[PDB]
Write a protein that binds this ligand. Structure first.
Ligand SMILES: [Mg+2]
Lengths: 166, 338, 355, 167, 84, 118, 119
């Protein structure tokens, strides 16, 4: 019973990893190892995302997946299995990573950047999503207010448009 | 810190030039050789309708461009190209060698000579797909082209720059009338009057190498193998070749048309070219369309024919006379392609 | 050297998918070898599916195949034994003699996929083939190197007409003919083999004037679509080595067309016609362009043509008729009543019947 | 757009990534309309009979690299996702012999007339190669159908494959 | 079995158009590429395999025979359909 | 009614073709490749599964009358054409005879039954 | 102002795919310009493909289009000159005169995509 549905379509790998972790343990350890993987990937751009091309034989994909295996086996948990199965499957590995962090975010942090008319970003770290969103919005309107690009209120234009058209 | 460096160094190896040399910008690697169209990875700097080299002598044209891969249609048998083979771009749009040096020469759909008479002296390289002249450069057809047939010259006359259709069922002339026209052009082609001279070109899509061989022999016998150019798209040659040959000959004739000379082009069995483009289309998984043909077959034939026109005096007063040939079923003008 | 090996990944009926290692991927139309308990099944390579996996078309039945079974690459297309050793022998699509008369000890084995002779090598002037039959080479003269269409049937003496053509071409010229039965019924084929054994066309103890490289109907699609190419390559070798006026017989060219439809329209591609392959004109050109006249010799095709629904405008008969040179009509009744050779004098036309 | 969608269609959906060993056995992924897509059965043969946990029989036609497609010989209701599938080890075969005379059998030789077990002289595979060219003889013996028109104008012989075409 | 044992046997396959329909059902349900009237690509191959097994054997093989009587139900007399 | 009650049954199904029509209807969205004339691939299978359960057994008899709707008055449509083989007595109503004023509209030729025996 | 730069990702015959950044997506049927060597190429946004990618239809030939080429958003649909000035002039799809009689001095350029006048 994963906290949030990725609905498959390139997102099944993240859900499978989360289920494998939730079976025993390592909801976090595998996740910081995966974050280290992504950091190593972005550290070398020409060598970290060009290598994820489909035009790559299985042997060289395996050599790459040993390549990320480095720095005192930071690869821990079932992440190694994810790279192993990705070598024999769809190669490039960023969106399922983002799906993994989003799933764990819904699992333990439960934040979302709503506000309807407000074009703000009030991220909240709390599972009880009843009233703390109001506190987050109050903090966001209090301090920060960097852009506040509302891009014209929609109620005014909508009401005017229905008024003139009858 | 040194371990990541060693990892990067060994990662740049065992992968070849996919991310180490040339970064598949000018070069590339074949992903999967499709039914007739190879899904090719790389070629980041390629452009649409660009000629490509497959390192095995097979040319290719970029019809399918995707953010990840680029689909290349095969100009020849797909056997010679393998998955993962080295593929590099020619750096230019699909181009055709053009000029007066092709007079008395027979070439393939890409301008490569096939008679084994040495290389061709080409004045320039005209693109295969050239936009037709607009309203102003065209001029109302007023100069006559004499085909030699009483029933065609006296009745239903054809003029220079006109696109006149020849319709036949199986063997009811068709290419024959084109041959009498070609041989009648000899009356003025031997003269010194450039305006009256007509540098004809011939298209042979879907025809046999044997039939084109006999055609060239007959042209040589009547001394017509001196001002006539033949592009041969044999049925053995791949469907993309049969597609390209009419545009090849269109560029050949457009060279004369733009340079003030008058040319005649016979799109012989354009129905065969239509079926070739149909094969190409449903090899691209394109919709079957209307009566098994892709919806752009009309666009194909139209953009092919519109290149033939009579240019105005401002554009050198050249002309390109088109004589397309449609092979019909039971003398039917109500079929799609006719 | 080290043989190229692969593993079977998918078996979709007659379609078999094989995965190879990097740089070991065979080109398409190549022959892949697998050792089966029943016999010697091989796979012709079709379009590459990527990830170092190639789609292949089975040359024989696919029963018993196991995923991951070892697949051996021959390094080239299907290779058929060729030469005078094949005369009088029965050869299937894969080159194996199914006449159980022993291995064909031929010094050469050419691939069935060869590029047709170039434009320069084509004969400049069309030539008439002297078939020695009065009704034939007066009203529908046979084109030397042409693709003659035999519009006969059953009971009109098609088999005896073919045998007489073989004998006449082998007498007047070298004429080492070859019979290619596309989609043979294994009963008509057996009967035909028995008759050529009875006549001088096939002589087991001595020399024979024809090779019966035909494929049975019970073979998968592609086998009927490549028996034509096997016999074509045999005739090509005969033309390009002995310099003979080879004569090639196709038992039913429409059967080749429908076999090509089943392999290349319904097994991975999209139909573009009444149901035939989108490449119908293309593979027709590949088959019948290699039948022409060269500087050394000339292979002449006498292919029996069947018209579906008696529809002359049908795109498969339209493609076949788009190049037939001369046609011979062994009519039912109007000609066989009385005249034994039949050959309807009126419907038998020719493109070379000119001065 | 540096990176495009990694996956478009996936056949292997399992996530344990360990302890597969599905050579002689497999597990159902998708069952419906008489087709049971099964993961595993790495040693299955083409159109080889297979056994399901529910007891219904099946014979596998499609052999995709990830999953193998088995057509079900009975109702698809008995087959459910995740059910254990085990190979029969043999191709489809039928009891053959003179005991089948006077008996009505199903597509697998099982007696459906309820007259008792079938006396089998042997078992032959349903998909067997037809006899070659040489082990044949020209059709000469007559099959007397008893119809005047048929036996007179369109005779049928032993070994022939005469078609009864009609509306 | 009868044919290879020297016995002459007749077989009436009867409706093969319905057999072709069942095979077409199997093919489309197996995501196989459909064809004429949605029929499978190798349905002609299927019928050829089925029919070629019925023939007259030689004396060396016991002189047995297998006579086939397939039946095809045409739709409105259309013998030009794919399976027919 | 037939088995447990042991009674003669007349199962009147009006235009049974709607069953096959609905099967072909759901098949397209069920991820099923359409058959000829855009029908479900399994049309014969599920239709026969329905039709065979309508039969006379040793426990009772079912005198079923089933109407069949032929699309476009085309008697060669796969659904009715295959339904024909599942039916003992056949009554075909063609539009042509009805157009002549014969209101029963039963075309006397193809209206055939197995009981028509001496 | 601030130009809206897009990158070509796919060129499918006469259809070109353009990728933009966050909050710079042109609406359906907007006109997009690329500075081709032969002039300018106009793209009409046919569909939004998501991930900030738009499927567009070409107003002219797509030959010579390299993936990643800069795409300029005109800010609206294709505008053709209107008024009595266009009378006697020959105009193509884009709106530029093709009668070689100089540019059209039209005061207004109404968009080619307009709603029907209803009832
Ligand atoms: Mg012609």
């Amino acid at each position: 019973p994963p906290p949030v549905r990725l609905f498959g379509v390139e997102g099944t790998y993240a859900t499978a990893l989360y289920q494998a972790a939730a079976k025993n343990s390592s909801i976090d350890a595998a996740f910081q190892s995966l974050q280290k993987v992504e950091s190593t990937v972005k550290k070398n751009p020409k060598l970290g995302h060009l290598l994820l091309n489909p035009a790559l034989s299985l042997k060289d994909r395996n050599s790459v997946i040993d390549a990320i295996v480095e720095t005192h086996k930071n690869l821990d948990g079932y992440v190694v299995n994810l790279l192993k199965v990705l070598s024999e499957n769809n190669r490039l590995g960023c969106f399922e990573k983002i799906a993994s962090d989003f799933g764990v975010l819904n699992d333990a942090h439960n934040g979302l950047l709503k506000g309807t008319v407000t074009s703000a970003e009030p991220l909240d770290p709390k599972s009880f999503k009843r009233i703390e969103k109001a506190l987050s919005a109050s903090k966001l309107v209090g301090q920060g207010k960097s852009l506040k690009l509302e891009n014209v209120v929609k109620p005014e234009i909508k009401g005017g448009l229905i008024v003139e058209l009858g | 810190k040194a371990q990541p460096t060693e990892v990067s160094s060994i990662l740049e190896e065992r992968i070849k030039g996919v991310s180490d040399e040339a970064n598949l910008n000018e070069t590339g690697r074949v992903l999967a050789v499709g039914d007739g169209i190879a899904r090719v990875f790389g070629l980041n700097n390629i452009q649409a309708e660009e000629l490509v080299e497959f390192s095995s002598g097979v040319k290719g044209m970029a019809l399918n461009l995707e953010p990840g891969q680029v689909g290349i249609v095969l100009f020849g048998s797909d056997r010679l190209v393998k998955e993962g083979e080295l593929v590099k771009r020619t750096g230019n749009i699909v181009d055709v060698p053009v000029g007066p040096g092709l007079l008395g020469r027979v070439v393939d759909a890409l301008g490569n000579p096939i008679d084994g008479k040495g290389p061709i002296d080409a004045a320039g390289r005209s693109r295969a797909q050239v936009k037709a002249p607009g309203i102003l450069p065209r001029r109302s057809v007023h100069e006559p082209v004499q085909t030699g047939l009483k029933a065609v010259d006296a009745l239903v006359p054809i003029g220079r720059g006109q696109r006149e259709l020849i319709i036949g069922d199986r063997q009811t002339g068709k290419t024959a009338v084109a041959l009498d026209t070609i041989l009648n052009q000899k009356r003025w082609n031997n003269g010194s009057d450039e305006s009256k001279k007509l540098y004809c070109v011939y298209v042979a899509v879907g025809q046999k190498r044997s039939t084109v061989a006999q055609l060239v022999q007959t042209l040589e016998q009547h001394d017509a193998m001196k001002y006539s150019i033949i592009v041969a798209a044999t049925a053995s040659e791949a469907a993309p070749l049969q597609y390209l040959a009419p545009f090849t000959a269109a560029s050949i004739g457009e060279w004369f048309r733009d340079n003030g000379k008058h040319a005649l082009i016979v799109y012989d069995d354009l129905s065969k070219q239509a079926v070739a483009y149909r094969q190409l289309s449903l090899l691209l998984r394109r919709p079957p369309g209307r009566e098994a043909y892709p919806g752009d077959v009309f666009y194909l034939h139209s953009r092919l024919l519109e290149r033939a026109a009579k240019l105005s005096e401002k554009e050198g007063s050249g002309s390109l006379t088109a004589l397309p040939v449609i092979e019909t079923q039971g003398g039917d003008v109500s079929a799609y392609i006719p | 050297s080290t043989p190229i090996t692969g593993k079977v990944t998918a078996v979709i009926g007659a379609i078999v998918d094989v995965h190879f290692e990097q740089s070991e991927l065979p080109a398409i139309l190549n022959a892949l070898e697998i050792k089966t308990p029943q016999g010697k099944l091989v796979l012709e390579v079709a379009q590459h599916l990527g990830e170092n996996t190639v789609r292949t078309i089975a040359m024989d039945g696919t029963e018993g195949l196991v995923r991951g079974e070892k697949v051996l690459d021959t390094g080239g297309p299907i290779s058929v034994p060729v030469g005078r050793e094949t005369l009088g022998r029965i050869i299937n699509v894969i080159g194996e003699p199914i006449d159980e008369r022993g291995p064909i000890k031929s010094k050469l084995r050419k691939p069935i996929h060869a590029d047709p002779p170039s434009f320069a090598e084509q004969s400049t002037s069309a030539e008439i083939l002297e078939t020695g039959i009065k009704v034939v080479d007066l009203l529908a003269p046979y084109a030397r190197g042409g693709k003659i269409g035999l519009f006969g049937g059953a009971g009109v003496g098609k088999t005896v007409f073919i045998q007489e053509l073989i004998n006449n071409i082998a007498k007047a010229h070298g004429g080492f003919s070859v019979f290619t039965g596309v989609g043979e019924r294994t009963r008509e084929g057996n009967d035909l083999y028995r008759e050529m054994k009875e006549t001088g066309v096939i002589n087991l103890e001595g020399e024979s004037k024809v090779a019966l490289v035909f494929g049975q109907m019970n073979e998968p699609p592609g086998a009927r679509a490549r028996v034509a190419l096997t016999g074509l390559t045999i005739a090509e070798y005969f033309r390009d080595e002995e310099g003979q006026d080879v004569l090639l017989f196709i038992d039913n060219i429409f059967r080749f067309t429908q076999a090509g439809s089943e392999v290349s329209a319904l097994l991975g591609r999209i139909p573009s016609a009444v149901g035939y392959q989108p490449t119908l004109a293309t593979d027709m050109g590949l088959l019948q362009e290699r039948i022409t006249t060269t500087k050394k010799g000339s292979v002449t095709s006498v292919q029996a043509v069947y018209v579906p629904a008696d529809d002359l405008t049908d795109p498969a008969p339209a493609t076949t008729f788009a190049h037939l040179d001369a046609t011979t009509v062994l009519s039912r009744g109007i000609s066989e009543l009385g005249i034994y050779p039949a050959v309807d004098p009126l419907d038998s036309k020719s493109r070379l019947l000119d001065a």
